[PDB]
Design a protein around this ligand. Structure first.
Ligand SMILES: O=C(Nc1ccccc1)Nc1cnns1
Ligand SMILES: O=C(Nc1ccccc1)Nc1cnns1
Lengths: 268, 263
């Protein structure tokens, strides 16, 4: 109970919160970059090479051995764009039917689909599921292919684990993509999508929980894309925290469509 | 005197520490992406039969991912070739193994490390024996004996003569036992993934233009031998200084950044 000591109390909170935000942003950046490399891998070794060098076995092995490159990812997978006119051909060739992600049932007729054809074993349950059959994933797929850049979903409960997380999606294009393409051209040139599951609930808890002073601090991360409807990305909420003092640390996960922030308070 | 001295010191520390962080992070990102390449060659060249990687594919993949390796002027893969295998190897590749210094056909050696895949930026490495340069040779041995990334001392790189360091990763055959001995590591070696860190050019690009660059003198040293520091970056000059920490990831080597004011 001292006014000089309270100034230092906030100083320590500022430093602790800022450090954790920097660690999170940096680890997400490293993960995004390594997912970009996988999109280029699929383009180079599956599409450009005649014949393809990538089968499910090969993708699984390579992504397992490189999992350390993608620290905030529980899994990565590649989904191919399939238009309805092609669906029966695609299914016959793969010897399986495109399924919905909610129940694993055969998909109803849709204009197009994004079935997962390659998966890291950690997310093997994605194989044959249509990634356009979840709304977060669908919206991400469209924005990925229309913008040509990595995009993030809003926070949602991931398949199987139900862990609160986000998905990162990169488009993969055909060689026919023109230089300086329009959005219409990007869509026409889309081959598929490289998706990575950021299991924030588990993997950020793992990151934060090992840090000295973790027991002293409450850390929440919000998606603040919509100012009037902030969305919990990480943290309880929802917790015994010091109401009288907080700090906002900045986060940039690199998708200009989305905005996020970190808020830290002391327990007591 | 006096408060202005204290602030002058604080600015030096801040400027130097920030440059050190930027350099260490770019080096770290580079190393991690080179490691991924070593894993790629292992998976596609050795684990798949037949090989599912070739020069065309390696050149494309490495060109497209060059942005992932910011401090590297190029990357290449050299295969381990023991002398008994040389005839068959040269017949297969339709070229002769060459010396690094002259590009002359290699005299007989017990083994060699010819470059078989190369990013086009270092295309001139193709067919050169990386064991024919002493820095690279030492790095190759330590890479394969330790099973981890290793760095050379600073030296002038081929063609450009830019002062730099080489990063080398071992690639092993699938016959490598678990918890292998060094002898087992050697026997299981397939080859070596090497990346040329062009320090002279690419660190100058990183640091050289930053605000306040004209006010300070920046050096990076290899201090592996404390009594024989080797310049990795900066001039050859031998009061107010600051040492900022660097860790480039090879326990065999030590490095530091030193910054000073001019006057
Ligand atoms: O994994 C994807 N999406 C995706 C996968 C591949 C390609 C594009 C997107 N979404 C998931 C939801 N729950 N766990 S993973
Ligand atoms: O490029 C390598 N070394 C290397 C290449 C491939 C595998 C192992 C080592 N050394 C170079 C010196 N000057 N420019 S590059």
């Amino acid at each position: 109970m001292d006014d000089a000591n309270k100034i230092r109390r906030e100083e320590v909170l500022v430093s602790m919160c800022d450090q954790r935000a920097r660690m999170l942003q940096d680890q997400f950046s490293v993960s995004v970059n390594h997912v970009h490399a996988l999109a280029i891998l699929v383009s180079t070794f599956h599409y450009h090479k005649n014949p393809s060098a990538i089968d499910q076995e090969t993708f699984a092995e390579y992504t397992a051995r490189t999992a350390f490159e993608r620290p905030l990812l529980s899994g990565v997978a590649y989904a191919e764009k399939v238009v309805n006119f092609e669906r029966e051909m695609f299914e016959r060739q793969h010897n399986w039917v495109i399924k919905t992600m909610d129940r694993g049932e055969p998909s109803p007729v849709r204009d197009e689909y994004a079935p997962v054809i390659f998966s890291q074993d950690s997310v093997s349950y994605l194989e044959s599921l249509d990634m356009m059959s979840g709304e977060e994933d669908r919206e991400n797929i469209l924005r990925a292919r229309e913008t040509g850049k990595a995009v993030l979903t809003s926070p949602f409960r991931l398949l199987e684990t139900h862990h609160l997380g986000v998905v990162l999606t990169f488009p993969v294009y055909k060689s026919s993509l023109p230089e300086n393409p329009t959005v219409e051209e990007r869509i026409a040139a889309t081959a598929g999508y490289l998706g990575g599951a950021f299991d924030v609930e588990s993997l950020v808890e793992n990151l934060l929980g090992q840090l000295a002073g973790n027991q002293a601090i409450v850390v929440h991360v919000y998606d603040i894309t919509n100012a009037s409807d902030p969305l919990v990305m990480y943290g309880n909420q929802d917790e015994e925290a010091d109401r009288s003092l907080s700090h906002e640390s900045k986060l940039d996960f690199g998708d200009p469509f989305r905005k996020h922030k970190m808020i830290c308070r002391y327990h007591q």
